Structure 1
Amino acid sequence: SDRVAQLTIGNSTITTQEAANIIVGYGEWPSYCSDDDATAVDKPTRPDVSVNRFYTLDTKLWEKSSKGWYWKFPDVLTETGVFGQNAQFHYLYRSGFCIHVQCNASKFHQGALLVAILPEYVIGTVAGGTGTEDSHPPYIQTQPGADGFELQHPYVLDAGIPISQLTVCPHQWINLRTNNCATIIVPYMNTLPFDSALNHCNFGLLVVPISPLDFDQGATPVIPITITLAPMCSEFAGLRQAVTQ
């Protein structure tokens, strides 16, 4: 009654029969902006079906020597579907997300992942190596899009913060002896109630193998990791022509 689930929203459902449990980030569901909070005076659009779908984005192969990946949300979906068309026309934006990452393996493979969220995941550099040149990260390390980006130094998460206490932020583990998926429901976290969808990326989805993959030779050596996400309770405002960046 906990191992088996089904998440239907929009026209797309996903079934899982070896889940762990759904955690709701910071204990509350995504919701619409109340009139106590809103400052924009134009009526928002709320598509309510066409953008609240599980978008399956990409597939990272996980071998025995991987480091970890990250996806900046919502810039994984400003190139995809009716979410990517409404977020490019409209200046303002708010939504929550239901984030579901699948990674199946046999009952002989082993290894654990820490799929975790963290809001305002800013990216530092190696500062020129020795630490004296103020190098800023490029635009693709900042906002990789639906392609994702691989961590260089996952012990410090490319930001000088340790991964050992990433477990404070909303997370759950995918260890291949127990579960194969990890649902994380995230509300809209930001100070101001709407923001731009092209500039500001509210959070980043860190997916790091902490305990590495291991399997005896003869088993299937290709163990993919696919993340599917669904913008919940999304609404846009401030209509103008299409910007792409």
Structure 2
Amino acid sequence: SDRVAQLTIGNSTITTQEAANIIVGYGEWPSYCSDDDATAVDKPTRPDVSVNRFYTLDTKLWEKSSKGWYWKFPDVLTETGVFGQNAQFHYLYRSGFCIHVQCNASKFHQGALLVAILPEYVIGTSHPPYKQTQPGADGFELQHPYVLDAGIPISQLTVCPHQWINLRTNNCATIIVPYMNTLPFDSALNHCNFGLLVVPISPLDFDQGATPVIPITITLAPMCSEFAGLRQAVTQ
């Protein structure tokens, strides 16, 4: 009664039979803004179910050579579903997320995927492009996973909301994160509160013959969505 689990938000439901439990970012659930932490004088919009639902976006293929990938939440979801609209129509944004990275295989396969969250995920390279800093859907790929393309050791990434997908045990990870920023609200069109990294620490291996197509899908869901500063529709 610890491996099986179900997630129900909006009009979406997720299932699992090899889950390794749920982790709550820094032990805190997504809460709305207090009437003292906010400065935006105007009742925001809490569409709820229409935006606070599960969205299955991108999928990648794990290989015996894959380096790793990453995404930028605030931006990623935009342009898709009712959520994207509010993010583009409104100026101020606020919300927490429920991430579910699923990746199954057979009992004859082996591999270990580290799935962690990194707040204010800045990258280096002498300045990365917009297609690298905000690769919304379909994300981007790591070139130097050892330094997370930022100059920091990945061996010390577990110091953040993380979880592992060791094929020999579980087949999916689940994280819950509350809004994070030195401000009550902030436009997600140009600022990403954090990013998701998926890196194979244990190279996916398996004897020839077993289906080599090992996909890794990403499914997330907004929580306690609040938008303010209603204006014209914007894209970036």
TM-score for the superposition, normalised by structure 1: 0.95
Note the residue ranges of structure 1 that are not aligned, 5 or more in a row.
124-130
**Distance in 2, Cα, partners of 1:49 & 1:138:** 34
CA–CA separation in structure 1 for the residues paired with 2:233 and 2:36: 30
Identity value in percent: 100
- Unmatched segments (≥5 aa) in structure 2: none
Cα drift, residue 15 of structure 1: 0.8
- Cα deviation code 1:76-112 (max 9, x no counterpart): 1111000001100000000000000000000000010
Task: Supply the distance in 2 between the matched residues of 1:16 and 1:217 (Cα, whole angstroms).
Answer: 27
Shift of 1:202: 0.5
Separation in 2, partners of 1:189, 1:79: 22
Partner Cα separation in structure 2 for residue 105 and residue 79 of structure 1: 32
Residue aligned with 1:233, SS: strand
Helix, strand or coil for the counterpart of 2:48? coil
Superposition map of 1:58-77 within 5 A: 58-77=58-77
Name the CA distance, whole Å, in 2 between partners of 1:177 and 1:36.
48
Deviation of 1:142 (Å): 0.3
1:172-200, Cα deviation, whole Å (9 max, x unpaired):
00000000110000111100010011011
Residue 88 (structure 2) pairs with residue 88 (structure 1): yes
In the TM superposition, what is the alpha-carbon distance from 1:25 to its structure 2 partner? 0.2
> CA offset at residue 36 of structure 1?
1.8
Deviation by residue 1:85-142 (Cα, 9 ceiling, x = unmatched):
110000000000000000000000001000000100101xxxxxxx99xx10000110
Q: Which residue of 1 aligns with 2:163?
A: 172
The Cα of 1:74 is off from its aligned counterpart by: 1.4
CA–CA distance in 2 between the matches of 1:237 and 1:158?
Answer: 34
CA distance in 1: counterparts of 2:142 and 2:4, whole angstroms: 32
Once the 2 structures are TM-superposed, how far is the Cα of residue 226 of structure 1 from its aligned partner?
0.3
Matched position secondary structure for 2:180? coil
Aligned-partner SS, 1:147: coil
**Structure 1 residue 35: Cα displacement:** 0.7
CA distance in 1 between counterparts of 2:178 and 2:203 reads 30
Q: Distance in 2 between matches of 1:171 and 1:105?
A: 21
The C-alpha deviation readout for 1:135-160, integer Å capped at 9, x for no partner, is: 10000110001111000100000000
Aligned to 1:199: 190
1:134-153 to 2 correspondences below 5 Å: 135-153=126-144
Q: CA deviation at 1:17?
A: 1.2
Whole-angstrom CA distance in 1 between matches of 2:139 and 2:48: 27
Q: Structure 2 CA distance, aligned partners of 1:189 and 1:74?
A: 11
Structure 1 SS opposite 2:84:
helix
CA-based RMSD of the aligned residues comes to 1.1
Deviation track 1:201-243 (CA, whole Å, cap 9, x = no partner) reads 0001000011010000000101000010000111100001111
Equivalenced residue count is 236
- The corresponding residue for 2:219 is 228
